[PDB]
Design a protein around this ligand. Structure first.
Ligand SMILES: *[C@@H]1O[C@H](CO)[C@@H](O[C@@H]2O[C@H](CO)[C@@H](O[C@@H]3O[C@H](CO[C@H]4O[C@H](CO)[C@@H](O)[C@H](O[C@H]5O[C@H](CO)[C@@H](O)[C@H](O)[C@@H]5O[C@H]5O[C@H](CO)[C@@H](O)[C@H](O)[C@@H]5O)[C@@H]4O)[C@@H](O)[C@H](O[C@H]4O[C@H](CO)[C@@H](O)[C@H](O)[C@@H]4O[C@H]4O[C@H](CO)[C@@H](O)[C@H](O)[C@@H]4O)[C@@H]3O)[C@H](O)[C@H]2NC(C)=O)[C@H](O)[C@H]1NC(C)=O
Ligand SMILES: CC(C)c1cc(CNc2ncc(C(=O)N3CCC34CN(S(C)(=O)=O)C4)cn2)cc(OC(F)(F)F)c1
Ligand SMILES: [Ca+2]
Ligand SMILES: [Ca+2]
Ligand SMILES: [Cl-]
Ligand SMILES: [K+]
Ligand code: NA
Ligand SMILES: [Zn+2]
Length: 802
């Protein structure tokens, strides 16, 4: 109930929301159907339009007008944004030369530069270049401020998940807004893009920027705008707020445009009808900047120009239909479109079996334009699993396509859509930062939108709530207010075991044909005490950030941190130069596993368990194929370098180790590799404790990894070899799912050179993803600044063209 007979006079776009049934005058009142009767009359004025003309200059204030051209408008803060241009001979902001903003130039009484977040829906990254001739205000922002070639959204590349990620610094699985529609089975309720349930506060987790600000004494304008409030009125309202007295004036604001998304859906990302929406957004930016300039705030305010996601070409005819695959199609509910989520239509159907569904959807047509996944098997880079609102069965849809349940659901209207995998080029969006706190004419590398919350906090002097950004990885965007973190302290120090066990103490069912001089006797002791470690451990040993028991093991070709709890390495580190040679496994060592006399039988794997486990085999973290010499090759067969691997995954691993590592050393002028296992049985993106492990090698305490990682590092200047690099580093990484079949790869019956690399690209990862999953902290000893290292740890190699 709304008692809509109260008044909005003197309350237009009130910041504090007032409780029902009292009628509201805030920028959302229309969305709750709850505005006072006189709201449109008093707060949505339109008379005489949005521009001064020559004849209105110096007019008598008439309060019916949309904006004013009278002499008192600047003091009042309600001039049309072109007032000084038309009436005082001033120039438009876009026609002024760019001049470096070295310090905030703010009116007296401003305690910090304000921040305005100018958010644009569906603004694809390539619009900055392709639409540059029709967007001169945006282009001036871009070239005079700090910009990135693109900004990576979160998955799914939908509106609310991205806007709310921007607000919180959280992945959708953590903030809770996991799609543009959702079913929460605990609440037994549904969330939709349209409608009222989305306003319930229980959907929205974490702490958004406006709350972070309020709790720390920084006032915020309201970020949300009802669709009917015209853009010009949004701008004028922000300008009015900025004219408030010091004690009432907010320090943070958001503008939102529904364009160019709204047109992009109808015409495609580059349809000829797209030029006008881009022109109109540019005009709006112009209105803000002229507006700020009249108030003497154009060298005071930090402005962020940012999109939620891009836009792809998608039409009705590129729809896949589950009714072409499933005979049971009416026993499921599909969340459809550019992704798919499946659950049982009824939870009382005991016949519904997800395994049969997955199987019926797997590699059934030769060009199938979606791939089914259990959500825990999705690429870890998507961070799209640890929420009850994400259905167990997921469909990753190819770019340019839709999935639907039946043809009747689709009957064409639209030519554009978004929602796909967040590494897809067409889904990329924009970032520009302009103002005293940003750098001047600076280009920064692409970065993820999860990082911006921290930076917005830095811009405002706020302490960010716990989030998924890596605070300091974006310090290179900022002139000042940088955040200078310290490296996490190591929690467990390693043991450095010497030779402590006799060969006959081991009864492991392991066999090796190895019963085979003082020059090379002292030479091999030094290799075991760590004499080559500077070659293979380039950036220091990783730090263990949790309580555990482990050992450092040195060898000629590799160093490892061996866990006595998980009975295998947490990490193995080695360097392969450009000139290194690949050799084969000699016949005398094919099923060789040798006890490691530094490590007790009781903290060692055993071969018998693998013999008994008919499903599980084993591989090696340091590849025997890349041993430096025949004598060094025996080290690769130590039981302490062994890890459990399904024979299907061994095809992947073997191709990586035997072919790809050498290929990368050739291309990159050497590589350093760190590899190891990951255990994430509860799909939370975080390292499992021992008691979370759901699968062991039969009859043993040897835990089975869910994934295997590798971090491949070299010199960014590839004319310098990886091991003698003076400057910045280059990295690519992977987190490969450790699966007993290759059902994920439809071409896996062919040679590994036709399908393994494609799998690995799909499972590309950031170093920081691996850190969360392992509790390790890498790159502890470089000669680089820590912030530069944090940037490197957040890099994702996407394998998309420019
Ligand atoms: C990305 O960054 C984020 C933010 O840092 C990381 O997420 C954090 O991860 C922490 C580690 O998992 C997690 O810590 C837990 O918090 C529990 C209290 O949580 C409530 O309070 C906080 C603070 O206000 C709030 O943030 C939480 O909000 C979540 O839940 C609400 C719904 O209630 C959602 O609206 C919101 O979206 C959010 O959901 C997300 O997180 C939850 C988990 O908290 C997921 O289940 C959701 O799917 C979704 O992802 C909460 O309102 C606290 O109770 C936990 O403590 C248990 O475990 C510890 C182990 O140390 C144990 O010692 C404790 O005693 C306790 O155990 C008991 O409970 C167990 C579980 O019921 C039980 O099994 C045992 O037997 C014990 O009796 C724990 O400290 C923190 O909440 C979230 N925060 C957020 C915002 O998500 C995230 O990890 C990062 N991601 C990556 C990849 O790095
Ligand atoms: C960049 C960050 C800081 C941010 C900006 C804004 C900006 N303001 C805003 N205002 C209204 C809408 C809106 O209405 N949008 C989107 C789809 C729909 C909903 N429908 S509709 C009106 O048809 O129901 C269009 C969207 N953005 C909001 C925001 O909060 C949030 F994440 F929760 F969104 C965060
Ligand atoms: Ca959008
Ligand atoms: Ca986990
Ligand atoms: Cl969705
Ligand atoms: K076996
Ligand atoms: Na296959
Ligand atoms: Zn859209």
């Amino acid at each position: 109930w709304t008692a809509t007979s109260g008044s909005c006079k003197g309350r237009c776009f009130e910041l504090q929301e007032v409780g029902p049934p009292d009628c509201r005058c805030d920028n959302l009142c229309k969305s709750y159907s709850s505005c006072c009767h006189d709201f449109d009359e008093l707060c949505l004025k339109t008379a005489r339009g949005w521009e001064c003309t020559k004849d209105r200059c110096g007019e008598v204030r008439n309060e019916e007008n949309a904006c004013h051209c009278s002499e008192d408008c600047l003091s009042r803060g309600d001039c049309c944004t072109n007032y000084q241009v038309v009436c005082k001979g001033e120039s438009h902001w876009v026609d002024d030369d760019c001049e470096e903003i070295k310090v905030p130039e703010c009116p007296a009484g401003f305690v910090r530069p304000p921040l305005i977040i100018f958010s644009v829906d569906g603004f694809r990254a390539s619009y900055m270049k392709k639409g540059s001739k029709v967007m001169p205000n945006i282009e001036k922002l871009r070239s005079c401020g700090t910009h990135a070639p693109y900004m990576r959204p979160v998955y799914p590349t939908k509106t609310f998940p991205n806007l709310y990620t921007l607000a919180t610094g959280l992945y959708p699985e953590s903030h809770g807004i996991v799609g543009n529609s959702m079913y929460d089975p605990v609440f037994d309720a549904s969330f939709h893009l349209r409608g009222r349930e989305k306003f319930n506060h229980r959907w929205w987790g974490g702490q958004p920027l406006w709350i972070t600000a309020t709790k720390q004494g920084v006032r915020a304008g309201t970020f949300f705008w009802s669709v009917s409030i015209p853009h010009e009125r949004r701008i004028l309202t922000i300008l009015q707020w900025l004219s408030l007295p010091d004690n009432e004036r907010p320090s943070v604001y958001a503008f939102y445009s529904e364009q160019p998304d709204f047109s992009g859906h109808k015409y495609g990302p580059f349809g000829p009808e797209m030029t006008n929406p881009l022109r109109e957004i540019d005009k709006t930016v112009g209105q803000l900047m002229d507006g700020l300039k009249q108030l003497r705030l154009h060298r005071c305010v930090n402005v962020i120009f940012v999109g939620d996601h891009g836009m792809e070409d998608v039409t009705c005819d590129r729809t896949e239909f589950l009714s072409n695959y499933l005979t049971n199609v009416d026993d499921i509910t599909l969340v459809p479109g550019t992704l798919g989520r499946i659950r049982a239509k009824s939870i009382n159907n005991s016949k519904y079996d997800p395994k049969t569904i997955i199987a019926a959807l797997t590699c059934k047509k030769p060009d199938q334009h979606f791939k089914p996944y259990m959500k825990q098997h999705l690429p870890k880079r998507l961070h799209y699993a640890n929420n009850r609102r994400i259905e167990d069965i997921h469909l990753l849809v190819d770019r340019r396509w839709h999935v639907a349940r039946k043809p009747l659901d689709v009957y064409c209207f639209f030519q554009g859509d978004h929602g796909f995998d967040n590494k897809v080029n067409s889904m990329q969006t924009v970032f520009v930062g302009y103002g005293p706190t940003f750098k001047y004419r600076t280009k920064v590398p692409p970065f993820e939108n999860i990082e911006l919350y921290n930076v917005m906090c830095d811009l405002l002097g706020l302490k960010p709530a716990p989030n998924n950004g890596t605070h300091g990885s974006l310090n290179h965007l900022l002139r000042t207010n940088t955040f200078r973190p310290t490296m996490p302290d190591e929690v467990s120090r390693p043991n450095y075991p010497g030779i402590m066990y006799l060969q006959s103490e081991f009864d492991l069912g392991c066999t090796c044909d190895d019963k085979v001089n003082k020059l090379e006797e002292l030479n091999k002791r030094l290799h075991t005490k760590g004499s080559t470690k500077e070659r293979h451990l380039l950036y220091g040993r990783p730090a263990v950030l949790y309580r555990t028991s482990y050992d450092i093991l040195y060898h000629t070709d590799f160093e490892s941190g061996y866990s006595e709890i998980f009975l295998m390495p947490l990490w193995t580190s080695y360097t392969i130069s450009k000139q290194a040679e690949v050799s084969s496994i000699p016949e005398h060592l094919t099923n060789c596993v040798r006890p490691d006399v530094r490590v007790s039988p009781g903290f060692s794997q055993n071969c018998l368990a693998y013999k008994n486990d008919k499903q599980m085999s084993y591989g090696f973290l340091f590849p025997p194929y890349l041993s430096s010499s025949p004598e060094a090759k025996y080290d690769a067969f130590l039981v302490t370098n062994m890890v459990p691997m399904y024979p299907a995954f061994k095809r992947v691993w073997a191709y990586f180790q035997r072919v790809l590592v050498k290929k990368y050393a050739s291309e990159r002028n050497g590589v350093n590799v760190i590899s190891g296992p990951i255990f994430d049985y509860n799909y939370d993106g975080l390292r499992d404790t021992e008691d979370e492990i759901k699968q062991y090698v039969e009859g043993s305490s040897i835990p089975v990894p869910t994934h295997y990682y590798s971090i491949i590092t070299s010199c960014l200047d590839f004319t310098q070899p990886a091991d003698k690099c003076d400057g910045p580093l280059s990295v690519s990484s992977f987190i490969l799912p450790h699966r007993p079949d290759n059902d994920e790869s439809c071409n896996s019956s062919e040679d590994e050179s036709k399908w393994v690399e494609e799998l690995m690209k799909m499972h590309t990862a950031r170093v920081r993803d691996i850190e969360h999953l392992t509790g390790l902290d890498f790159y502890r000893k470089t000669s680089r600044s820590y912030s530069e290292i944090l940037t490197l740890k957040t890099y994702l190699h996407t394998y998309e063209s420019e």
